[PDB]
CSV table of C-alpha atoms and ligand atoms in Angstrom, one decimal:
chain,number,residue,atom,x,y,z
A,1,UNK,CA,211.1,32.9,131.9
A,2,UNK,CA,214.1,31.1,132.1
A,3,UNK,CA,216.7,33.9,131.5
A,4,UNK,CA,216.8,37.3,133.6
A,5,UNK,CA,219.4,40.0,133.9
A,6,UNK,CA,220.2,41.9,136.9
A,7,UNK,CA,222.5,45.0,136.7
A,8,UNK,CA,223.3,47.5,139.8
A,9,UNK,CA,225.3,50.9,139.7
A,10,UNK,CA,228.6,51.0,141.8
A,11,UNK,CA,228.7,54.9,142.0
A,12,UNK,CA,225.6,55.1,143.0
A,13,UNK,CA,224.4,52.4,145.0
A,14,UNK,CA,221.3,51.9,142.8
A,15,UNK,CA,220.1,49.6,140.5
A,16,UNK,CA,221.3,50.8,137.1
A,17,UNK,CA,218.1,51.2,135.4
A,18,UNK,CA,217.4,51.9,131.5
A,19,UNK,CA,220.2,49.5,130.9
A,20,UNK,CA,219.7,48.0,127.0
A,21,UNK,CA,220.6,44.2,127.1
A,22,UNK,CA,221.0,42.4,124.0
A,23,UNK,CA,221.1,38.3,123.9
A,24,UNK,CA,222.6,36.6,120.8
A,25,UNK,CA,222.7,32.8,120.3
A,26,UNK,CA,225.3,30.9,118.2
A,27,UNK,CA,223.9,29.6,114.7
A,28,UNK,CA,224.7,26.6,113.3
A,29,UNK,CA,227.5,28.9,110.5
A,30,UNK,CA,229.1,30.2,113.9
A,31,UNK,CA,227.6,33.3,113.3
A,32,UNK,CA,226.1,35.1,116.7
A,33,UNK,CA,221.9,35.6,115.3
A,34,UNK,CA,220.0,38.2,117.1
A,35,UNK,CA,218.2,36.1,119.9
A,36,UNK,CA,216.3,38.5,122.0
A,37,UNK,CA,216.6,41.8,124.1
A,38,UNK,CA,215.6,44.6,126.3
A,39,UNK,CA,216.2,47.0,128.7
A,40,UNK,CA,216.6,46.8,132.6
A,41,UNK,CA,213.5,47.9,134.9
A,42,UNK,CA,213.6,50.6,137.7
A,43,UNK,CA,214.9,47.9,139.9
A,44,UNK,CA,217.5,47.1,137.8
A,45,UNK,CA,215.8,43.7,136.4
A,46,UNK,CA,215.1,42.8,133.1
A,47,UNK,CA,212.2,40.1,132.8
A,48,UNK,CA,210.6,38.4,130.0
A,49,UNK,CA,213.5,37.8,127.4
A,50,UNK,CA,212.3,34.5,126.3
A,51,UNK,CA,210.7,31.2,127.0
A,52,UNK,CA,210.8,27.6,128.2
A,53,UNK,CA,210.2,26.7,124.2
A,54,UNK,CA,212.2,29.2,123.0
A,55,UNK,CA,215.3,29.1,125.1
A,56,UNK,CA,217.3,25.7,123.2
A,57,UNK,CA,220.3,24.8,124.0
A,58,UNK,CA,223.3,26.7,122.5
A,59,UNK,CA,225.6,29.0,123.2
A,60,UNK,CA,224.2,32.2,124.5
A,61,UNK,CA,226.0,35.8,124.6
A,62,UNK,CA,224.8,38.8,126.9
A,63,UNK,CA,226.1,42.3,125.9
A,64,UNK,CA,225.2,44.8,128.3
A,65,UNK,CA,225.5,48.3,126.6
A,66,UNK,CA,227.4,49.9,129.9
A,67,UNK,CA,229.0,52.5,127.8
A,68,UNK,CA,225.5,53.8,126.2
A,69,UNK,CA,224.3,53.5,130.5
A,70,UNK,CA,227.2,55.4,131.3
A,71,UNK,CA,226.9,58.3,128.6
A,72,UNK,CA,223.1,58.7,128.8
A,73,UNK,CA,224.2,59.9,132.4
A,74,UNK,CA,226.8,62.3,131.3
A,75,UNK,CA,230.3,59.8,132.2
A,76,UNK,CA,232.7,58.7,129.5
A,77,UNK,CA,233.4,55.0,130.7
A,78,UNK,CA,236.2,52.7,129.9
A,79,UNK,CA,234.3,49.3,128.6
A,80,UNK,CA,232.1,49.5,125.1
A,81,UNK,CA,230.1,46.5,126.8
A,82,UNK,CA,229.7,43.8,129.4
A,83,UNK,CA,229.7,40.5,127.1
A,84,UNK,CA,229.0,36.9,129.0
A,85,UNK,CA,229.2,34.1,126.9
A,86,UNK,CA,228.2,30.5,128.5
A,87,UNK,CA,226.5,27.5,127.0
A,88,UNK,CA,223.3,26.9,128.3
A,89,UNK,CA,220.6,23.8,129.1
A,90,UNK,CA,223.2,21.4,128.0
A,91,UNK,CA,222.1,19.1,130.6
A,92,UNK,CA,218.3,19.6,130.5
A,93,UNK,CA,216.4,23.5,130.9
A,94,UNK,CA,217.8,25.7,133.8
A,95,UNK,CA,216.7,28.9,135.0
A,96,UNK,CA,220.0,31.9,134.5
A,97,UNK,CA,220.0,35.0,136.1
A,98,UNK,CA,223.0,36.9,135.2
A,99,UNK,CA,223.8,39.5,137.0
A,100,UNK,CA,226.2,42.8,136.8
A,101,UNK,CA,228.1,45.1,139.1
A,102,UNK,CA,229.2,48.6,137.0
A,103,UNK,CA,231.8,50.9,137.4
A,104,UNK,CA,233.3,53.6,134.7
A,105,UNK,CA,236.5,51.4,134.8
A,106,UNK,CA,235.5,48.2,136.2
A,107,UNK,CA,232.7,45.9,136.2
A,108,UNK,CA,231.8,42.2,137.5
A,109,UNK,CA,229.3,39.6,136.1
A,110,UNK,CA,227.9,36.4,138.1
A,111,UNK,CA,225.7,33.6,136.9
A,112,UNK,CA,223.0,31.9,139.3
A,113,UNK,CA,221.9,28.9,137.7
A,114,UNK,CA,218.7,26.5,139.3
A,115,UNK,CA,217.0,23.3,138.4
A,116,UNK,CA,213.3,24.4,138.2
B,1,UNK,CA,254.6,48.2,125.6
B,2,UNK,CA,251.3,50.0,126.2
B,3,UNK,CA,248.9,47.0,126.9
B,4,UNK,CA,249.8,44.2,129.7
B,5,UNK,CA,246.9,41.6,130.9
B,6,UNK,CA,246.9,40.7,134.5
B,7,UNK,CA,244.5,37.5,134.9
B,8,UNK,CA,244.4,36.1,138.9
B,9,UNK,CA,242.2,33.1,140.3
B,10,UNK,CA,239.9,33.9,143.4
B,11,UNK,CA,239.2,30.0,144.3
B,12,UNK,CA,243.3,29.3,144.7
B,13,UNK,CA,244.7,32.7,145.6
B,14,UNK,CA,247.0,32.5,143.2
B,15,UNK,CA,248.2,34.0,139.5
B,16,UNK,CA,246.0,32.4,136.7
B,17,UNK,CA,249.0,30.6,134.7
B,18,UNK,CA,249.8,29.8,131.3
B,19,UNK,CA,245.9,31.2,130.6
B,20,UNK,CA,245.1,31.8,126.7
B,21,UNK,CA,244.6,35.4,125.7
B,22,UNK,CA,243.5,36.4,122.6
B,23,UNK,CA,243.2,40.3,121.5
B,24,UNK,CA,241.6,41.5,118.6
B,25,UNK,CA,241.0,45.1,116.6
B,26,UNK,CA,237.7,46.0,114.9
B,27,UNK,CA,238.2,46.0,110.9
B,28,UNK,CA,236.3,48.6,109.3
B,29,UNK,CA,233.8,46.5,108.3
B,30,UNK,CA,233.2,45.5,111.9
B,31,UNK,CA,234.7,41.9,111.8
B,32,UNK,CA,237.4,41.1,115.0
B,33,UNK,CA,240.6,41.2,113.0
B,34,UNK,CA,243.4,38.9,115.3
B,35,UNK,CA,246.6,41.2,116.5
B,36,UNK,CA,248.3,39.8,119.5
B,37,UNK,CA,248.1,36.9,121.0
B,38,UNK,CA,250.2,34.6,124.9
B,39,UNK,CA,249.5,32.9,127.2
B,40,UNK,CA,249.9,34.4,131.1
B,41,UNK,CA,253.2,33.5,132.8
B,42,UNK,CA,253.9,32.1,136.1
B,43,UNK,CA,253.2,35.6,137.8
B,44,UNK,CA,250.0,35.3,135.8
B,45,UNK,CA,251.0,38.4,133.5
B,46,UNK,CA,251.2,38.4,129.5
B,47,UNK,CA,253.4,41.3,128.7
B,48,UNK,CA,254.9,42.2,125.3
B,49,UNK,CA,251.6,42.2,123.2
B,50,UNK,CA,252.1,45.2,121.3
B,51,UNK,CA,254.2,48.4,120.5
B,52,UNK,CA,253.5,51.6,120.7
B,53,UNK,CA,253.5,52.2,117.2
B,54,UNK,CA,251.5,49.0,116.3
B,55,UNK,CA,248.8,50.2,119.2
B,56,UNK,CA,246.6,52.8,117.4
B,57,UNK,CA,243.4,54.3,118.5
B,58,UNK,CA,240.3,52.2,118.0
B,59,UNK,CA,238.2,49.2,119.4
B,60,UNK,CA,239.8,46.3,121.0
B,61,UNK,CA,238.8,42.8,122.2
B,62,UNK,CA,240.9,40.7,124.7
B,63,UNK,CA,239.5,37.3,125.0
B,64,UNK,CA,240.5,35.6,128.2
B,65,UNK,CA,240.3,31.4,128.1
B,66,UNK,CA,239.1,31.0,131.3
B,67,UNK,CA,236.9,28.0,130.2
B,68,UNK,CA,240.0,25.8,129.6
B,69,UNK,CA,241.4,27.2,132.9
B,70,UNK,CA,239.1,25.6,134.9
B,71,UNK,CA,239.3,22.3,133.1
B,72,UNK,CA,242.9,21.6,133.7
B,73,UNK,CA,242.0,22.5,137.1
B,74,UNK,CA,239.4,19.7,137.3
B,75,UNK,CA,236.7,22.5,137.6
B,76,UNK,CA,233.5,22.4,135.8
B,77,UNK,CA,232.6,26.6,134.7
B,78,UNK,CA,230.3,28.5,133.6
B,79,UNK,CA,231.7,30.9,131.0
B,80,UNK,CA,233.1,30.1,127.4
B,81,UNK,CA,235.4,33.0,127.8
B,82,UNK,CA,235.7,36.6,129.1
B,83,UNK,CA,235.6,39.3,126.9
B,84,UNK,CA,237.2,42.8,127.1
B,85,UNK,CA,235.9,45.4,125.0
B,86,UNK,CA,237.5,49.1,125.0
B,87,UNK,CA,238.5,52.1,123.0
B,88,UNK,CA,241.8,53.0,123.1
B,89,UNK,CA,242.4,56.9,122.9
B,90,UNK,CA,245.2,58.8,122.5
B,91,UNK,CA,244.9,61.9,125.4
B,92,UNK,CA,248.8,62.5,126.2
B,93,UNK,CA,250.9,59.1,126.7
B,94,UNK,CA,249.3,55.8,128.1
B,95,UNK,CA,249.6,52.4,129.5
B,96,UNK,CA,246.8,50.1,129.8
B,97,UNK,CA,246.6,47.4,132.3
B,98,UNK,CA,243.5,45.1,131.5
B,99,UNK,CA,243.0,42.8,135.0
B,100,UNK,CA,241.2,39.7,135.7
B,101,UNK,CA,239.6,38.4,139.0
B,102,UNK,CA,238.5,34.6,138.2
B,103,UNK,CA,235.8,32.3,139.9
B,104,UNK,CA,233.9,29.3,138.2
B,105,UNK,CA,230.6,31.4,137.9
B,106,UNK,CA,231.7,34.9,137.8
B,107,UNK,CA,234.8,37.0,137.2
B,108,UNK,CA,235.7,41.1,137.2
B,109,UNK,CA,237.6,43.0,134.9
B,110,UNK,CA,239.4,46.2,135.9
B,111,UNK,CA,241.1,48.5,133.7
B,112,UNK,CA,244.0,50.4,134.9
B,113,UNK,CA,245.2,53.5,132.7
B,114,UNK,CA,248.4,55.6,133.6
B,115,UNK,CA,251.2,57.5,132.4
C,1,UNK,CA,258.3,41.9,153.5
C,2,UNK,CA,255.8,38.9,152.9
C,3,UNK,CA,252.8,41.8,153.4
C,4,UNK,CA,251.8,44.1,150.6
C,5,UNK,CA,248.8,45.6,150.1
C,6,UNK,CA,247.9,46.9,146.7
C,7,UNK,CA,244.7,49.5,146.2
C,8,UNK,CA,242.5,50.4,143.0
C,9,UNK,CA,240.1,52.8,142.4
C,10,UNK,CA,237.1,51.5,139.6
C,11,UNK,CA,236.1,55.4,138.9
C,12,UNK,CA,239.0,57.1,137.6
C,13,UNK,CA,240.6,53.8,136.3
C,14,UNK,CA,243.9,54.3,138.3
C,15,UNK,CA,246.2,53.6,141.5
C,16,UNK,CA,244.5,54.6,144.6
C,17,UNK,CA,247.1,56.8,145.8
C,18,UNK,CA,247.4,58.2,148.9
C,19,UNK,CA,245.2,55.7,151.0
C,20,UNK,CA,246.1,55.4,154.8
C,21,UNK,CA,246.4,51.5,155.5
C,22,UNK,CA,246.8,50.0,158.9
C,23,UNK,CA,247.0,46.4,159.6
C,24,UNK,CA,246.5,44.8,163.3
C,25,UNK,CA,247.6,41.4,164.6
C,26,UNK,CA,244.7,40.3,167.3
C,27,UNK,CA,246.6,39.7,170.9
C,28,UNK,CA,245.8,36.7,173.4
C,29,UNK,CA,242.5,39.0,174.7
C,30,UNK,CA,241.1,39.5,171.3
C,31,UNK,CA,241.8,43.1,170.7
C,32,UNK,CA,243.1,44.8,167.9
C,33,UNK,CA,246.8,45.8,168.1
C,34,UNK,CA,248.6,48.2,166.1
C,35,UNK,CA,251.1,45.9,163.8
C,36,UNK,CA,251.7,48.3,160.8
C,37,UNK,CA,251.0,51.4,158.9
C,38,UNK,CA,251.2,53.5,155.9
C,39,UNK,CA,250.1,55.5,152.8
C,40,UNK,CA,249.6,53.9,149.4
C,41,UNK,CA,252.5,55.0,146.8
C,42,UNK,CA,251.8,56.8,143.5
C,43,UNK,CA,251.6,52.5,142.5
C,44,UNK,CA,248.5,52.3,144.8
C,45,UNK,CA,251.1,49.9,147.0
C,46,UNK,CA,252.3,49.8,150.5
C,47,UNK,CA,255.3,47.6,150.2
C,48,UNK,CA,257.8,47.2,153.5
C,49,UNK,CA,254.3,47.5,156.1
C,50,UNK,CA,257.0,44.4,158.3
C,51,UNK,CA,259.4,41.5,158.1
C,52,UNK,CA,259.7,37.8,157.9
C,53,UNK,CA,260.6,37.7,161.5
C,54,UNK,CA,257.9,40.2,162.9
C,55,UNK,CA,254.9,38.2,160.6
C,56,UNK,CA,254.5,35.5,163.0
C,57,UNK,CA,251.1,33.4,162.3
C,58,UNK,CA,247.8,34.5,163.7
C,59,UNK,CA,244.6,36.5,163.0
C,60,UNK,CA,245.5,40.1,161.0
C,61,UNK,CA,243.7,43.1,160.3
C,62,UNK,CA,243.9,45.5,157.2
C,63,UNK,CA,242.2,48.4,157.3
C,64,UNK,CA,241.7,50.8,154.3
C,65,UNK,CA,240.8,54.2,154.7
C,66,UNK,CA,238.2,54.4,152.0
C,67,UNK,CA,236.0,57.0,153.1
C,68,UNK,CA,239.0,59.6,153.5
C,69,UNK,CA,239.8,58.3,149.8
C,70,UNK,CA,236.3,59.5,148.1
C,71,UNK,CA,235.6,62.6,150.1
C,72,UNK,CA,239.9,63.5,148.8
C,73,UNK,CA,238.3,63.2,145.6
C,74,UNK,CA,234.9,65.2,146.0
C,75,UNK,CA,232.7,62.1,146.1
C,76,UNK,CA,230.4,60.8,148.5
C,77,UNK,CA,231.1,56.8,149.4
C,78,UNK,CA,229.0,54.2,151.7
C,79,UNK,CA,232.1,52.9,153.9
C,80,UNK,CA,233.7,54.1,156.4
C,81,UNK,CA,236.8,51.8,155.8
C,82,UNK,CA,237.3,48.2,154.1
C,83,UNK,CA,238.6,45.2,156.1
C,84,UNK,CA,240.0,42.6,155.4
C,85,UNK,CA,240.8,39.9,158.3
C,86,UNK,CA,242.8,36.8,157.5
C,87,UNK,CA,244.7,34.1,159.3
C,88,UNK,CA,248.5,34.1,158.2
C,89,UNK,CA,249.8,30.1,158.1
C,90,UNK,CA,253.2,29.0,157.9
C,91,UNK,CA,253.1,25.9,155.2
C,92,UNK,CA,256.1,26.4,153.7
C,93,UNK,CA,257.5,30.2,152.0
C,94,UNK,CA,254.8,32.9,151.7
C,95,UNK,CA,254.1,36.1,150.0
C,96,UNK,CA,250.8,37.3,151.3
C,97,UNK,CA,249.4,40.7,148.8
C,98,UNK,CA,246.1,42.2,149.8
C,99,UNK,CA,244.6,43.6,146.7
C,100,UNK,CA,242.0,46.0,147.1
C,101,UNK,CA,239.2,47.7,144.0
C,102,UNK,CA,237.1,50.6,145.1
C,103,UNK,CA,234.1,52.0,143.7
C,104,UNK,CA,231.7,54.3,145.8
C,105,UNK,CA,229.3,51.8,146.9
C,106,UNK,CA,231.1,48.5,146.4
C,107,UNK,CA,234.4,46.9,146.7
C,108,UNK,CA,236.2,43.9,146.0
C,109,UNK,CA,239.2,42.1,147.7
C,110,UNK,CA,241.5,39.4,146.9
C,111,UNK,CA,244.7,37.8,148.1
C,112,UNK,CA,246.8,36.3,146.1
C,113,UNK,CA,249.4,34.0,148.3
C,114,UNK,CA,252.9,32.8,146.3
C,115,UNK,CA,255.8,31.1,147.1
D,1,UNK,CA,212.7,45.6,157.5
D,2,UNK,CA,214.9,48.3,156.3
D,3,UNK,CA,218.3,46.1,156.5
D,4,UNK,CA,218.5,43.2,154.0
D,5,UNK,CA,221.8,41.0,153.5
D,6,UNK,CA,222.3,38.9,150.3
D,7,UNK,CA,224.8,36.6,150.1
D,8,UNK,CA,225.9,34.7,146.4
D,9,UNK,CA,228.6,32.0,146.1
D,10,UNK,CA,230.8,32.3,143.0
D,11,UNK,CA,232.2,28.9,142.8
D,12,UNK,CA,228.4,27.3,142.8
D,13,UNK,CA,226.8,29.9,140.8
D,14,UNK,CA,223.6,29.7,143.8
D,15,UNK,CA,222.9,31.7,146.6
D,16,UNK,CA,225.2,30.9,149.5
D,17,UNK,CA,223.0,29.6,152.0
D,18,UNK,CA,223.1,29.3,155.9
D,19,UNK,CA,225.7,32.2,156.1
D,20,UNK,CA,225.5,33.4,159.8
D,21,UNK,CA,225.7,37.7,159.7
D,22,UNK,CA,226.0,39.6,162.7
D,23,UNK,CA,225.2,43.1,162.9
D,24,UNK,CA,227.2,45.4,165.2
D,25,UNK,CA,226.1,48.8,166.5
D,26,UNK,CA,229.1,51.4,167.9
D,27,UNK,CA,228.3,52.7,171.3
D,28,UNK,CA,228.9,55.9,172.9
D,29,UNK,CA,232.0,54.5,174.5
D,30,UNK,CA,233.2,53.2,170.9
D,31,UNK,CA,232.4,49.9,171.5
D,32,UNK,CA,230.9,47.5,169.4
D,33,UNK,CA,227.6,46.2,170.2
D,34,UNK,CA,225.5,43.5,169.3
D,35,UNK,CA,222.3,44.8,167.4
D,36,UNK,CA,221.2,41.8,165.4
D,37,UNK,CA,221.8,38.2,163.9
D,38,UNK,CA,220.7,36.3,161.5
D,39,UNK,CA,221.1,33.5,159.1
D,40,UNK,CA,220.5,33.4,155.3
D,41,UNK,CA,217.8,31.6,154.0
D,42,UNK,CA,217.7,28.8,150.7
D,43,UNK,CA,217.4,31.9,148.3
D,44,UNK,CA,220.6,33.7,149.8
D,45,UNK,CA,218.7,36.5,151.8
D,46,UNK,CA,218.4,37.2,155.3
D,47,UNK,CA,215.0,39.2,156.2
D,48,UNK,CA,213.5,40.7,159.3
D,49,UNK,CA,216.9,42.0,161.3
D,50,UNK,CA,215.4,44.9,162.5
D,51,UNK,CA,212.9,47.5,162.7
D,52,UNK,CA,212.3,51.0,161.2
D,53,UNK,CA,211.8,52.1,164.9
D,54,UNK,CA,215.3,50.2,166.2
D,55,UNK,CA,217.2,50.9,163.2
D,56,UNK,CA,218.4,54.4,163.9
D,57,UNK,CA,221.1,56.6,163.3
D,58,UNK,CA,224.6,54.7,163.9
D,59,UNK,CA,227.7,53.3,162.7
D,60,UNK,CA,227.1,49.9,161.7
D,61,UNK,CA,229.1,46.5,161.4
D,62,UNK,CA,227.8,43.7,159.3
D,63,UNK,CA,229.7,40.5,159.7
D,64,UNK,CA,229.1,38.1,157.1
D,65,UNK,CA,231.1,34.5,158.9
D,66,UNK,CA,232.9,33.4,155.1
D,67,UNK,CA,234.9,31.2,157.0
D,68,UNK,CA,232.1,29.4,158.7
D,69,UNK,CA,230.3,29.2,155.7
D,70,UNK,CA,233.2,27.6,153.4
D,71,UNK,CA,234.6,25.3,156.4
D,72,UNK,CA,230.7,23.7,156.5
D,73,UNK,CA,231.5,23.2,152.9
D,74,UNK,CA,234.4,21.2,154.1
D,75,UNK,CA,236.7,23.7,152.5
D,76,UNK,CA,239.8,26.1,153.8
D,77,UNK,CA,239.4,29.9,152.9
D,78,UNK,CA,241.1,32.5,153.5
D,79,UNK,CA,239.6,35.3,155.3
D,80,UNK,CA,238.1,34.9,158.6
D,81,UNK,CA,234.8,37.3,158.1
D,82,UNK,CA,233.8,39.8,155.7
D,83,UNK,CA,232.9,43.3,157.6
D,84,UNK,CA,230.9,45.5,155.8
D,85,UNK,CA,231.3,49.0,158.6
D,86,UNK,CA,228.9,52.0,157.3
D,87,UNK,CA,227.0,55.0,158.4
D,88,UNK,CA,223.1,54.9,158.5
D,89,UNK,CA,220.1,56.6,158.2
D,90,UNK,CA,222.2,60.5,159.0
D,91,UNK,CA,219.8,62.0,156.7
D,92,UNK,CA,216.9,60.2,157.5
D,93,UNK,CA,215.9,56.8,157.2
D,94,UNK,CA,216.8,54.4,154.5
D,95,UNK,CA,216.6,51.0,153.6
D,96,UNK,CA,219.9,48.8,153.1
D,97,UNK,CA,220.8,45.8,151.1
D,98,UNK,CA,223.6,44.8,151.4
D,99,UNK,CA,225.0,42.1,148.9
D,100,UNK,CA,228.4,40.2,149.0
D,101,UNK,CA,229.8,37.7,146.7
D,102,UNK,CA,232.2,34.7,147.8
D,103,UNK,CA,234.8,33.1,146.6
D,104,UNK,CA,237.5,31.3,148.9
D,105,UNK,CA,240.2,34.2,148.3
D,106,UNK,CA,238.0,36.7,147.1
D,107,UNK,CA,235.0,38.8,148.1
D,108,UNK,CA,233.1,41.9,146.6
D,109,UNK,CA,230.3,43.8,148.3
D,110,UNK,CA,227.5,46.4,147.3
D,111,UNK,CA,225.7,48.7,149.0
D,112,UNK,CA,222.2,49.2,147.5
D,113,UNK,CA,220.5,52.3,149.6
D,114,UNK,CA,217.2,53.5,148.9
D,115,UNK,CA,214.7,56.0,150.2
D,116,UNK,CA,211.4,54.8,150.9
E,201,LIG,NA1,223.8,17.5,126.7
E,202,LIG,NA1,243.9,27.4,126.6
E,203,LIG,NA1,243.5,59.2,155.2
E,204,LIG,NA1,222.1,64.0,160.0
């Protein structure tokens, strides 16, 4: 799978599990279609979004629902979402982890991209 | 003015200048309707987006153009944009600072809310 | 002052006020020596930690008190302080800020050097 | 090995590799002492700096050399280390990861404790 998201809890030091993640690619009307999602592991991981075949160039958006992570724990956050937008496999199929760093108030997002 | 974006760049050290920022409010029938729009000045600030009046409780989008940043550095990155999404409530009087820390392949948002 | 130090807190969404902050300038022997000192304003700045003529180049110190910070609060953090260690360079007029964001288990820094 | 160190660099989007990290133990007299060392590997991670039996109860000092790492690059940063200074294993043994994420002016890091 050539897409994986990675989210950890700054309160707690912990991954920040049961974390719903949904992907959307750009159509061809610029309208963002439903593309694929899921919700993060135990460790914080979510695996198996897509495929190889599946995963065309195009521009890709990740929400993270951190609000609906922070409520189903009893917090009233600041952000209704993490959203990262990029373009992806524009020069040929990579491999994306994306990854997360919450906060109530504040949160990070990096990208590791490889040539498999 | 209740809402101020702070945008800085972590590869220079420096402000984030003349950056695009775009903010939008959710229409009713959930489509991002535009409402302010700058771009950051030499202190890397945009101030003077809004009023209080005009700054009513709901959802918000600020749209950051950090792709184009990087370009007219000579940079190649990673993101089209970064998005900020937030309610803003009403709970006695309020400022919002919505901040920026930008690298090529990642970036963090901060919101800072005072009165 | 061409020092400031500016700290966040990522919980509450606010100024981190109230911080103890000392900064140390390393001597010929390689220990630490006191330089400056102070508590974060109601801003979450220290501004006036020392002076054009006392900030001579070499290896500096900050040193946030984070751990007195979250326990203040009620809550239970992973540091014991932050530090942040930096070479100050002449190369022409500087303004040197030391931005800090705190969360529990995490934080950032950044500096952001102007002219 | 219940100490881990991850290091990511933000301008590449990779793992930043060859870091050097020293570990620092305080002393009874207050002094800093050399526990462990270690570089990271091609995926970012140092493994296998200690021991459940020699990790105990301390103040700790992780020293991830930034400067090093970027000047290799062939480029000038600005801080001269990160130093990540915690408490460990006071109510029993844990295990540690802890994560940092470079960028010349800029660094965060995360602690992610669990209990085995
Ligand atoms: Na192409
Ligand atoms: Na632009
Ligand atoms: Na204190
Ligand atoms: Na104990």
């Amino acid at each position: 799978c050539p897409l994986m998201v990675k989210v950890l809890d700054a309160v707690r030091g912990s991954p920040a599990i049961n974390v719903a993640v949904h992907v959307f690619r750009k159509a061809a009307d610029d309208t963002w279609e439903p593309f694929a999602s899921g919700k993060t592991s135990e460790s914080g991981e979510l695996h198996g979004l897509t495929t190889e075949e599946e995963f065309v160039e195009g521009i890709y958006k990740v929400e993270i629902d951190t609000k609906s992570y922070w409520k189903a724990l009893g917090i009233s956050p600041f952000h209704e979402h993490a959203e990262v937008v990029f373009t992806a496999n524009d020069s040929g199929p990579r491999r994306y982890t994306i990854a997360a760093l919450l906060s109530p108030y504040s949160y990070s997002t990096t990208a590791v991209v490889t040539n498999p």
